[PDB]
């Protein structure tokens, strides 16, 4: 698993999930 | 796993989850 | 597992869990 | 298990968790 | 485990905690 | 189980905990 | 300017206003 | 300006306002 | 500015205002 | 500024004002 | 600035304002 | 500033004003 | 002999066995 | 012989064995 | 021989055996 | 031989044996 | 013979046998 | 013969055995 993130200049966000039963 | 996060000016974030039953 | 942040200026986090039950 | 923060300025945080019934 | 925290300027923490039954 | 802080200027912090029932 | 990312609501009932409100 | 990431509510009854709100 | 990230809220009934609010 | 993170709620009933508020 | 970091919160009943308050 | 860090309130009943305030 | 009379049941989920089971 | 007469179940999460058993 | 009458239950979760059982 | 009468049970998480039991 | 009558139980958590039992 | 008439519990946290118990 990866995840990454340049330079920026404002609002940005992950919400990558994985798995079962999340509900 | 891995995460990481390069320079930036401004809000980020990483909500990443994994497994079951999260409910 | 691995976690990691480089040089920024404001606002970050990382709320990342793995697990069952979270409820 | 792992984590680990370069140089900032300003506000970061962690709250990475892992385990079951959290609740 | 680990923890660890580079230079900073500015307010940081990790809230980070395992096991279960946390309630 | 290990805890580390390198050189800072100002606010830090780790509640890292682990072990259950802690309600 | 907001966000509502990310969110997992398992059950709700007889509610009012759950998400991300402005002005 | 305001994020509203990463809430796993399991349960909510007979509620008001559960999410981000602003002015 | 604010946050709103990482909750975990297993159950609330006959609640008001349990979520991120400004101005 | 303000920051609302790492909660774990486990129950609340009959409640005002529960999360982060500001101005 | 403020932080409302880590926090859990068993149980709670009948209650007003039991998180991070500014101005 | 203020940090309102690593918190554990098991029971709370009737109560007002249980978190970080300021001005 | 048994008697299953009357319920509401006014959610459910996720759940086993709700109703009346013998022998 | 038994009776399961006049419950209300607001709300049911996760659960087993809710209802009237016998031998 | 059991009863089981005029229950209100308001709120139930993750639970186990939460009615009228007998031999 | 046994009643189940009359109960309010506001809420209740992760619990067992709630209710009238025999033999 | 016994009876569990006119309780109120306003909230609950994390419990073992909270009514009425026999033989 | 027994009764279990008129409580009130206002709260109660990972307790066993609150109610009337025979034989």
Request: charge should be neutral; proline fraction near 0%.
């Amino acid at each position: 698993f990866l995840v990454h993130s340049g330079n920026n200049f404002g609002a940005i966000l992950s919400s990558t999930n994985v798995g079962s039963n999340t509900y």
